Amino acid sequence: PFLKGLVNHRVGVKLKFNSTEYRGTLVSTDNYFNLQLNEAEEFVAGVSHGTLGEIFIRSNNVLYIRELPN
Amino acid sequence: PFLKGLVNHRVGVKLKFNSTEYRGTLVSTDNYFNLQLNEAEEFVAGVSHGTLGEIFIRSNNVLYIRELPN
Amino acid sequence: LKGLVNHRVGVKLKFNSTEYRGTLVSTDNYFNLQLNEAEEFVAGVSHGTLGEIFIRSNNVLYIRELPN
Amino acid sequence: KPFLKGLVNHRVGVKLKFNSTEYRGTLVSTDNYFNLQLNEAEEFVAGVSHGTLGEIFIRSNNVLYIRELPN
Amino acid sequence: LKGLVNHRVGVKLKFNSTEYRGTLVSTDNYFNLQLNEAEEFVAGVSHGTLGEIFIRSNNVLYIRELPN
Amino acid sequence: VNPKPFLKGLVNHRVGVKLKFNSTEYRGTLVSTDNYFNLQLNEAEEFVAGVSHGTLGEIFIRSNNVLYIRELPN
Amino acid sequence: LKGLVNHRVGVKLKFNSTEYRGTLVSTDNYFNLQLNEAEEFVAGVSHGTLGEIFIRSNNVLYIRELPN
């Protein structure tokens, strides 16, 4: 259970392009890396550009995912 | 599935190359992320650029999908 | 997607404000599609009539139903 | 199950994503993959002939679309 | 590849001379890997420490083992 | 019993493998292949603008980068 | 591809005109390869020695055996 380990945890989704990162609670996923983020907050350069709701992010745009410091 | 949850909801599909977002009622979908929108309205930088009928969007172009709130 | 066959549609190419309009003869899950009486549209101006075309998904952004 | 099959032995135009290049020829064979064989191939750039290539085998990816060339 | 599990490796992305270093926790044929105590390196300068990161193959150029 | 190599005929023939980017062509003998368009070229000569840029031995090419393959001469 | 295992090969990337030279330890049917004693060559010049590297298929242009 590689990716499932992060469910119900607060993570940072970083994209390949720009320095953009979505931070939120990782609702659901799938091997495909397609993921579901709740209470997602958009971060640019480490600055908040708002809160998006529940977003479904597609794998292809993802560089990597991290667990947000408790 | 993953996106079956949003069916019949008003959602925003955000593309990966421009500040464009298509808004509408997600009629149907599939794992491949390929979605059909109803009452689609194109949004550029947050500005309506008019209305397309029923559109079918190809996953590949999709950055993420959120649920529209009002 | 089959809900549009023999309907007048527009196939929007991702890369440049180019959209092919015609009737959607046939398709398949793959988003590869066959268009009839294709008309290529640049920034919404016609650039002539292509015959029947068989287009490749990958180049497609979206497909919409052309009116009335 | 074959897709385009209906153009085999037809005079068609294979247009590429980048460069207004068009490879015109007859189609030997094609498979669901859109990878296709072309006979008596003539490269076209902007509507101009830039020569003739033998028989070519094209890779789907670089293909925007295919059309039937007017009899 | 599983030869590197519990190994200090370095992940080099395709774009931009950015390498992620840390211990290779787990992986799979898909090249999608987990990295523990990752440290972002840019042009071979530490840009910080990411906690545990899960990387997507497609961004990866190559992986190497960090020297003893 | 259902699928086979659609490029079978060119094996051991003098071909030209053209890439998507540049105007680089790799000419050689088509050693082997596979539906995947992944091919083994023997006596591979790098061509740029129809100009030789030396010779590469046996090369193993990847389909992705390949625009099209053609048959070189009699 | 297996015909190169334990051979000295040079791997060519699509983007920089820079090649990875080394012993081809392993490879699977995905074009991903493990290279031992990798040396990185830029426009024909050596820019250093990487240890063991596992290279991802997508980045590769082509593979050749070496006149050593």
Side-chain angles (χ1 to χ4, degrees), chain A residues 1-58 60-70, chain B residues 1-58 60-70, chain C residues 1-56 58-68, chain D residues 1-59 61-71, chain E residues 1-56 58-68, chain F residues 1-62 64-74, chain G residues 1-56 58-68:
Chain A
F2 199 85
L3 248 172
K4 316 230 175 97
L6 282 168
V7 171
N8 268 290
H9 289 86
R10 200 169 182 62
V11 291
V13 185
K14 175 104 165 184
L15 311 173
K16 337 155 72 179
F17 54 79
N18 297 301
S19 55
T20 304
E21 175 176 86
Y22 296 116
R23 303 169 183 189
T25 293
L26 172 57
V27 165
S28 71
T29 322
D30 59 82
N31 311 286
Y32 248 67
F33 257 85
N34 280 310
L35 23 80
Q36 199 199 326
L37 223 64
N38 174 309
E39 270 173 274
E41 205 196 350
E42 189 174 75
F43 284 75
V44 167
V47 180
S48 169
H49 288 205
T51 326
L52 306 159
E54 278 270 307
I55 59 186
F56 293 68
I57 291 167
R58 260 275 283 186
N60 309 151
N61 313 304
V62 196
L63 186 59
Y64 73 63
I65 317 186
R66 53 167 197 149
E67 171 176 35
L68 309 170
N70 33 229
Chain B
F2 186 93
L3 297 162
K4 197 176 146 206
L6 286 174
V7 163
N8 268 301
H9 283 78
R10 191 164 187 66
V11 295
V13 183
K14 166 121 195 158
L15 310 159
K16 24 135 72 126
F17 43 75
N18 291 283
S19 51
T20 302
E21 173 187 63
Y22 294 114
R23 296 172 188 182
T25 304
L26 174 52
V27 151
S28 84
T29 315
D30 62 79
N31 293 296
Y32 257 68
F33 252 84
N34 293 286
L35 33 81
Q36 186 200 341
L37 228 59
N38 206 310
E39 271 200 65
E41 198 184 352
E42 190 183 53
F43 283 80
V44 176
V47 178
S48 168
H49 275 211
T51 307
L52 317 158
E54 285 267 297
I55 73 190
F56 291 73
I57 292 183
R58 256 274 281 193
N60 295 170
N61 317 299
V62 188
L63 182 64
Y64 69 71
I65 312 178
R66 49 156 196 154
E67 171 171 52
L68 304 174
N70 94 216
Chain C
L1 222 170
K2 306 190 176 174
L4 286 169
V5 174
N6 264 283
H7 289 81
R8 198 165 185 58
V9 312
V11 188
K12 190 81 183 177
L13 305 172
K14 14 147 81 162
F15 49 94
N16 266 312
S17 75
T18 294
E19 164 200 73
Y20 298 109
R21 305 167 189 172
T23 306
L24 175 50
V25 161
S26 53
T27 341
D28 58 79
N29 295 278
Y30 254 66
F31 253 88
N32 287 298
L33 33 72
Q34 197 187 312
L35 204 76
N36 203 310
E37 279 163 56
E39 204 171 355
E40 186 182 76
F41 274 87
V42 169
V45 175
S46 156
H47 278 202
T49 301
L50 299 169
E52 281 282 278
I53 79 191
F54 294 76
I55 295 170
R56 269 272 293 182
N58 314 150
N59 316 299
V60 183
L61 171 71
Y62 75 72
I63 320 182
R64 42 157 208 154
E65 174 171 50
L66 296 174
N68 305 314
Chain D
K1 257 113 181 195
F3 182 95
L4 286 96
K5 198 150 168 204
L7 287 166
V8 171
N9 273 310
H10 285 82
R11 198 176 178 54
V12 313
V14 179
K15 174 98 180 192
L16 310 165
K17 327 160 92 178
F18 55 85
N19 293 305
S20 53
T21 308
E22 191 164 53
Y23 297 113
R24 291 180 194 171
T26 297
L27 173 56
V28 151
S29 43
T30 297
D31 54 283
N32 296 288
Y33 258 68
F34 254 92
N35 274 302
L36 44 72
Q37 194 188 330
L38 212 68
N39 182 327
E40 273 178 41
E42 210 194 352
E43 191 171 71
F44 280 87
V45 181
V48 181
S49 171
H50 274 222
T52 316
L53 310 148
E55 283 258 314
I56 59 184
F57 298 65
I58 297 180
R59 260 279 283 188
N61 188 3
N62 317 293
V63 188
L64 184 68
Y65 73 62
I66 311 177
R67 71 172 172 149
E68 174 169 33
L69 301 172
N71 33 210
Chain E
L1 210 183
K2 294 189 186 184
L4 289 166
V5 183
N6 225 307
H7 293 80
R8 225 187 152 47
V9 307
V11 191
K12 188 90 196 181
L13 302 158
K14 331 150 104 106
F15 54 92
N16 284 306
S17 106
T18 298
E19 185 180 63
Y20 298 115
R21 299 176 203 168
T23 302
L24 177 40
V25 166
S26 61
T27 178
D28 91 77
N29 299 287
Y30 256 73
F31 255 90
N32 282 318
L33 35 93
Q34 189 182 330
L35 210 66
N36 183 317
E37 280 159 66
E39 197 189 350
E40 207 181 61
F41 281 86
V42 169
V45 176
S46 142
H47 269 220
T49 313
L50 306 158
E52 285 240 293
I53 71 175
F54 294 68
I55 301 189
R56 266 277 284 189
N58 321 152
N59 308 314
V60 178
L61 172 64
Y62 69 69
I63 318 174
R64 57 159 189 148
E65 172 168 50
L66 295 186
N68 295 88
Chain F
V1 194
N2 265 1
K4 44 144 199 205
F6 167 83
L7 267 127
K8 181 116 191 246
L10 297 171
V11 160
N12 251 318
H13 288 84
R14 212 163 164 57
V15 309
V17 182
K18 175 109 176 227
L19 312 166
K20 325 144 104 181
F21 55 85
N22 296 314
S23 74
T24 294
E25 180 174 59
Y26 294 113
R27 281 174 206 171
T29 297
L30 187 38
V31 164
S32 43
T33 313
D34 67 73
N35 296 287
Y36 256 75
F37 261 79
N38 281 312
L39 38 76
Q40 192 189 339
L41 218 72
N42 185 327
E43 275 182 68
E45 201 180 352
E46 183 159 84
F47 281 80
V48 186
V51 185
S52 183
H53 278 217
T55 300
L56 314 160
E58 283 252 299
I59 58 180
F60 295 74
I61 300 184
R62 271 268 287 181
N64 293 187
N65 327 310
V66 178
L67 184 57
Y68 74 65
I69 320 155
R70 56 163 198 147
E71 170 166 35
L72 301 175
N74 4 227
Chain G
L1 225 173
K2 302 201 172 182
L4 293 167
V5 175
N6 261 299
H7 280 88
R8 201 155 172 71
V9 307
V11 184
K12 180 104 180 179
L13 309 166
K14 336 151 79 202
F15 13 92
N16 283 302
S17 178
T18 298
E19 189 181 61
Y20 292 109
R21 292 196 193 153
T23 324
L24 175 50
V25 158
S26 54
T27 310
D28 62 83
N29 301 302
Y30 235 70
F31 252 93
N32 293 291
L33 23 70
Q34 191 195 349
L35 211 64
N36 180 319
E37 272 184 63
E39 198 178 350
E40 178 179 60
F41 284 80
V42 181
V45 191
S46 165
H47 280 208
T49 312
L50 309 165
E52 271 259 307
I53 83 192
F54 299 76
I55 285 178
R56 265 266 297 182
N58 307 156
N59 313 303
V60 184
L61 175 55
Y62 73 53
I63 322 166
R64 48 155 204 155
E65 118 195 282
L66 306 167
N68 11 223

